Amino acid sequence: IKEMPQPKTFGELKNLPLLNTDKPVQALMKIADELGEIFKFEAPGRVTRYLSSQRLIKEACDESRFDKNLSQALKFVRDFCGDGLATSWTHEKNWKKAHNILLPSFSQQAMKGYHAMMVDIAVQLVQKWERLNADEHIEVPEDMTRLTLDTIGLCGFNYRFNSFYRDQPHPFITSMVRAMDEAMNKLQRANPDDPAYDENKRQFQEDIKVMNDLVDKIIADRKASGEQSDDLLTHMLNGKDPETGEPLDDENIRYQIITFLIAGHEVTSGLLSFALYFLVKNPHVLQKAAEEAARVLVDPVPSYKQVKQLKYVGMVLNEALRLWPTAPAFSLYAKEDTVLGGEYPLEKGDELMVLIPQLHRDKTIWGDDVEEFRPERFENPSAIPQHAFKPFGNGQRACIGQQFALHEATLVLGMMLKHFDFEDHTNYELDIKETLTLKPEGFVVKAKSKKIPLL
Numbered sequence: 001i002k003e004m005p006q007p008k009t010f011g012e013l014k015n016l017p018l019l020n021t022d023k024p025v026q027a028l029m030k031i032a033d034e035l036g037e038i039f040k041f042e043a044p045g046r047v048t049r050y051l052s053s054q055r056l057i058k059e060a061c062d063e064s065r066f067d068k069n070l071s072q073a074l075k076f077v078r079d080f081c082g083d084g085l086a087t088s089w090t091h092e093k094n095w096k097k098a099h100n101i102l103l104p105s106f107s108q109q110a111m112k113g114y115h116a117m118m119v120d121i122a123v124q125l126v127q128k129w130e131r132l133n134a135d136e137h138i139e140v141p142e143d144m145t146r147l148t149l150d151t152i153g154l155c156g157f158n159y160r161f162n163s164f165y166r167d168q169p170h171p172f173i174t175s176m177v178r179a180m181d182e183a184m185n186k187l188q189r190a191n192p193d194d195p196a197y198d199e200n201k202r203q204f205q206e207d208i209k210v211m212n213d214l215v216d217k218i219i220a221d222r223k224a225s226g227e228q229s230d231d232l233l234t235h236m237l238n239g240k241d242p243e244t245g246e247p248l249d250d251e252n253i254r255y256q257i258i259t260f261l262i263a264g265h266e267v268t269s270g271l272l273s274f275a276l277y278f279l280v281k282n283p284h285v286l287q288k289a290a291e292e293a294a295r296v297l298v299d300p301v302p303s304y305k306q307v308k309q310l311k312y313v314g315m316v317l318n319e320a321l322r323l324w325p326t327a328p329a330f331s332l333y334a335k336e337d338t339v340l341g342g343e344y345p346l347e348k349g350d351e352l353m354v355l356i357p358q359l360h361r362d363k364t365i366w367g368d369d370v371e372e373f374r375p376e377r378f379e380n381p382s383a384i385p386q387h388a389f390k391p392f393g394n395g396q397r398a399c400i401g402q403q404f405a406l407h408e409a410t411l412v413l414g415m416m417l418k419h420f421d422f423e424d425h426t427n428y429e430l431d432i433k434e435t436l437t438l439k440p441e442g443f444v445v446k447a448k449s450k451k452i453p454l455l
């Protein structure tokens, strides 16, 4: 039985002030560098254990021993995502019911139906960049978020956010971002009922009311029109859980839509932003990915089958997820008493955090070159040890949107590589901005058209 280490404490605040920082995930990664594969993290009324080694995480991913926990962050997000799929406990009736209903909407097979709508938005991105003047540049995360937001809006419920027509965010997005910020900022308030925060609470409720009212009207409008657009909303309005025989109710449908829009916003655009960052920093890798794009994407717009054939582009995306997974942690609890790694006894109910970026830097798995960007690591999934690579979570609670995100990202990155040469014209210094997701803040490039038509 080993005692686990613990980072520095602040008296009765315990470790909580360590997360009173602009970049808490990177702070936790530095703590893991100092303390090793496991450390205890205490706050007032809270104890968790951060895991960073594949040795321990492979045990944490044993679904017979550990189930998904709502982290404090997810408990705060649940105030506006409700019992949608990502903020539900596994034992809540609406988790399994929504899971069974929505799985066919998110499969590779469903991607064939979404493909034309994804192409629609990808073409708008390419056309924007074709239309820039000589020495203008691209604001990468900003344009990637325009693309991913528009793609989930259109595939999700046939709604055009028209992000490439505007600078100012959509009213839904304004309230979503401000609610997420309040949820993230609240992971520090010792006296949340202090009259000091009444304005934060008032604003938080107005933002929740904005999201609910707007989504509820999208649902009511679709029901009033009878239109059967083949999108996630139609699937939720018509689908029935094979187990209970029941459909989702309108309240839970709204929670799912809010959940999908958040997932498809900066969490997914972050992947594209980091991938393009690593490509311009590794010109030989960019060259190889651009050679694949040219060879495969032989038609004016890509087909579904062509996207599946962008194997090296897919490897680029997985290697970007290895280094900077954009949903950087998930939480587990012990279903029963158990011992972790032969060394750390856990009681039923004890909580674990999986620190994904640090897992993905385990040199016993990847070798000494863990910081290098080498997509070839992903040539063969059977050569990767179990539970070494977890950017989409674990088990039945893994990301339902994984195929959607990777199809979207592979399509757009392929088209980017086909149509432009890229310049890191500022020699950009990576600065990772943290919300509940991760983003290369201020990442800019110049894109020179190869003058290949879309017609």
Ligand code: HEM
Pocket: 068, 085, 086, 087, 099, 152, 259, 260, 261, 263, 264, 267, 268, 271, 325, 326, 327, 329, 330, 331, 390, 391, 392, 393, 394, 396, 397, 398, 399, 400, 401, 402, 404, 405
């Ligand atoms: C690269 C992009 C994405 C990444 C890295 C990602 C990552 C993750 C991770 C790590 C989890 C597990 C969370 C936990 O255990 O607490 C998760 C769950 C989930 N994600 Fe994603 N996600 C991505 C894109 C998406 C998209 C595009 C959608 C939907 C449009 C989506 C919808 C969901 C849902 C509904 C869940 C909860 C699944 C369940 O518990 O049944 N995600 N995602």
Ligand SMILES: O=C(CCCCn1ccnc1)N[C@@H](Cc1ccccc1)C(=O)O
Pocket: 019, 041, 042, 043, 046, 048, 071, 072, 073, 074, 187, 326, 327, 328, 329, 330, 353, 436, 437
């Ligand atoms: O350490 C994370 C990382 C957040 C990851 C969120 N996220 C969302 C999607 N992907 C990842 N959270 C913890 C933070 C914490 C720990 C102890 C005490 C108070 C607060 C938590 O929330 O309790």
